[PDB]
């Protein structure tokens, strides 16, 4: 299915920081439509949107929780999930935007990512019949400085237990890791226990603009198997679709002159403002691709973009998700992730199911 | 006028064997038995005009003892009651099963027995008072291109592995000299003098078995049919006699597995030597049956040259390859499907019998 990305924005509002250093609003919410007024006075820019949250406020109308973004963004792709499409949402945006407070959120308001597994597993729970069996596993991992590290391995004991692993291509399924530790799920509980040790163990640290940021690349990876029967007097179980999900928490450019920082901090700085270039690049001749153009992709000119090759492209039903911020301070990198995005909307995969009738005769008799 | 039926007996497992859950490599389609290596490097097929497939109880068409009997052992029976020569050959590896065939169980019989207590029973059909009977039998050994008689028992001395020669009659055919008669009616004591004789038979201790056929065996049947007739006087002297021939064959060994030293390499020499010679007279019997003019080396070992009349003209006879199905000893069953084989052996290769789901070529088709 030739189709589009669902891209999606949330204005958080304003902090501390700007209450003890005064800076104004600047983005307005019609509704749903973004405008952005210049500090100058001098241009509104505006975008338009699939969805937007207008999460400056709690009263005018546009806004929404968590769940009510779920239930506007990422439980579609549950559906599509049980239709057996592969799956993508991933976050963009700076740093105290936050992007990891909608993904994934806290303990007292968790993200998205929790709120989609929890639906997940009760979805499942809603036809755990023979009907179609279901089986469930997830990955979860870690980017930092180009080095892919495991987030739900408990290390060692050492002064070195970043253990470092690499990618592999298959010919067919794509780009994967080795000895990536899928593990099987239960339900929603286990995930929620994976995931904070996951996220406990993230390659973390607190800084001059946010008292913990995500300074690594975090992917969140599921994948819903399901057999079923088939349309035969004889082994009726011998369908079956697989359908991967991909949920991705990225970090923000984090400029030095604000991050004022030395040695590793800004090392892994350079390395993420280079990895999210090579995606933005990415995601514009994709664009350009959705227009009929005829474009080299480079995939390759890093890690990130080459796992996720078949999330941004190839075949899932995908959305992104932006977080810009209100003070004009930062107007400048919210109008870079407000264009990221209303450039985003603008780009297609072709999304199927994952049947798998390898060695079945099914899809050879459809 | 004679003719020979080749056939083959396939063993199941046995205990060990499905212990170990050793891979099946003998497979069969009708009288067809092939052998996959399990590397698929070779698929081959041997061909009998009979095949007696004992590995499953549930398998259509299992043969069971009486089965085979019935089927190759019993016709030479009424062959025999006929009035002419008649014979068997068994010719396989070590743990094949030759005795399991042969001679079977005391519980569950073989064709010996079967055929034993049913030629008793088949001529006491026939026991009037037109008609005598008379049968006696004999047993011997080759070994080293040597004969002993299986039914002396060896004295308190060195031994009495007293070597006999082989005379040529000249009207009838050869025969051994001093070799000592019995007489028999029954079973029983078929049996009471082969207590002695298959304890007389050399044997060895190899690393295919604890005991293993050092030496040919053949044991055949004297039958005497005296019949009178009406000649305007006193009715008599009207003669009719077969003989029955049962042939305990060695098994071959190749040297350089059987890594060992001395007396235990010549026979395996003598025993090959034999076993080729016997492939070779086999063989031109069948072109001859073909019809095929050709030259018989008889004469090339004592063992074809005792059964050269048994195995020639009005001669029927037939040869029970045995062999095992395991993966195991494989290279051993190939080997005796080899030599059982009579117009050459059938080998290619096939790894396609996977179309990967319910004949996908269905589809592709
Ligand atoms: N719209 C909002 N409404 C209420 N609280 C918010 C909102 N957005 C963010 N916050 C809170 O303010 C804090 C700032 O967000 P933060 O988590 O620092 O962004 P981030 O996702 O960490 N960016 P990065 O660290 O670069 O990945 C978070 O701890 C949130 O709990
Ligand atoms: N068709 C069969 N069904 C079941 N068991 C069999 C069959 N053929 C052989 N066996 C077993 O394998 C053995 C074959 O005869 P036996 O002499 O006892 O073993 P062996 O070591 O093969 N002796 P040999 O006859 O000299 O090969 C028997 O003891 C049986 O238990
Ligand atoms: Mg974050
Ligand atoms: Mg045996």
Redesign the pocket.
Same mark, same amino acid.
């Given at each position: 299915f030739n189709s589009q990305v669902t891209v999606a924005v !949330?204005? !958080?509002?304003f =902090?501390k920081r700007e209450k003890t250093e005064k800076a104004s609003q600047v983005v307005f919410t019609n509704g749903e439509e973004i405008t952005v007024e210049h500090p100058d006075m001098k241009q509104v820019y505006s975008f338009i949107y699939d969805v937007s949250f207008w =999460?400056?406020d709690e009263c005018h109308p546009g806004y929404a929780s968590q769940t009510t973004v779920y239930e506007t963004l990422a439980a579609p792709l549950l559906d599509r999930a049980f239709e057996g499409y592969n799956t993508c949402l991933f976050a963009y @945006?700076? $740093? @105290? #935007? @936050?992007? #990891?407070? $909608?993904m994934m959120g806290?303990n007292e308001?968790p993200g998205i990512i929790p709120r989609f597994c929890e639906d997940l597993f009760a979805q499942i729970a809603k036809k755990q019949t023979s009907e179609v069996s279901y089986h469930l596993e997830m990955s979860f991992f870690e980017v930092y400085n180009e080095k892919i590290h495991d987030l739900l391995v408990c290390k060692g004991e050492n002064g070195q237990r970043k253990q470092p692993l690499r990618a592999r291509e298959h010919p067919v399924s794509g780009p994967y890791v080795e000895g990536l530790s899928m593990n099987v799920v239960s339900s929603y509980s286990d995930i929620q226990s994976w995931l904070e040790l996951g996220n406990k163990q993230r390659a973390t640290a607190a800084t001059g603009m946010?008292?913990? +940021? +995500?300074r690594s690349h975090s992917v969140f990876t599921l994948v819903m198997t399901q057999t079923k029967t088939e349309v035969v007097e004889g082994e009726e179980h011998d369908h079956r679709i697989t359908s991967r999900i991909n949920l991705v928490?990225?970090? @923000?450019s984090?400029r030095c002159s604000t991050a004022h920082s030395s040695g590793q901090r800004l090392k892994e700085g350079v390395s993420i403002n280079k990895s999210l270039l090579t995606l933005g690049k990415v995601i514009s001749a994709l664009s350009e691709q959705a227009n009929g153009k005829r474009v080299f992709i480079p995939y390759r000119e890093s890690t990130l973009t080459w796992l996720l090759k078949e999330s941004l492209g190839g075949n899932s039903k995908t959305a992104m998700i932006a $977080?810009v911020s209100p003070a004009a301070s930062n107007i400048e990198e919210t109008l870079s992730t407000l264009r990221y995005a209303t450039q985003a909307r603008l780009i297609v995969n072709i999304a199927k199911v994952n049947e798998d009738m390898n060695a079945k005769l099914i899809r050879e008799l459809k």
């Amino acid at each position: 299915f030739n189709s589009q990305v669902t891209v999606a924005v !949330r204005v !958080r509002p304003f =902090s501390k920081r700007e209450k003890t250093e005064k800076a104004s609003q600047v983005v307005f919410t019609n509704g749903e439509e973004i405008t952005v007024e210049h500090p100058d006075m001098k241009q509104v820019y505006s975008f338009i949107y699939d969805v937007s949250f207008w =999460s400056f406020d709690e009263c005018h109308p546009g806004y929404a929780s968590q769940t009510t973004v779920y239930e506007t963004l990422a439980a579609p792709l549950l559906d599509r999930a049980f239709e057996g499409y592969n799956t993508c949402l991933f976050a963009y @945006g700076q $740093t @105290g #935007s @936050g992007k #990891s407070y $909608t993904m994934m959120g806290l303990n007292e308001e968790p993200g998205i990512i929790p709120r989609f597994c929890e639906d997940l597993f009760a979805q499942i729970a809603k036809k755990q019949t023979s009907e179609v069996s279901y089986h469930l596993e997830m990955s979860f991992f870690e980017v930092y400085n180009e080095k892919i590290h495991d987030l739900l391995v408990c290390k060692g004991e050492n002064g070195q237990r970043k253990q470092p692993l690499r990618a592999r291509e298959h010919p067919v399924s794509g780009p994967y890791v080795e000895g990536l530790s899928m593990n099987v799920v239960s339900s929603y509980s286990d995930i929620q226990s994976w995931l904070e040790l996951g996220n406990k163990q993230r390659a973390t640290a607190a800084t001059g603009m946010n008292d913990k +940021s +995500s300074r690594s690349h975090s992917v969140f990876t599921l994948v819903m198997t399901q057999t079923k029967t088939e349309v035969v007097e004889g082994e009726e179980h011998d369908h079956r679709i697989t359908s991967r999900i991909n949920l991705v928490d990225l970090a @923000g450019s984090e400029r030095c002159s604000t991050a004022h920082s030395s040695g590793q901090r800004l090392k892994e700085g350079v390395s993420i403002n280079k990895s999210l270039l090579t995606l933005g690049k990415v995601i514009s001749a994709l664009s350009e691709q959705a227009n009929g153009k005829r474009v080299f992709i480079p995939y390759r000119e890093s890690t990130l973009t080459w796992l996720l090759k078949e999330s941004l492209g190839g075949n899932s039903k995908t959305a992104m998700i932006a $977080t810009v911020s209100p003070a004009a301070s930062n107007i400048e990198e919210t109008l870079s992730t407000l264009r990221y995005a209303t450039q985003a909307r603008l780009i297609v995969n072709i999304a199927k199911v994952n049947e798998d009738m390898n060695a079945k005769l099914i899809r050879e008799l459809k």
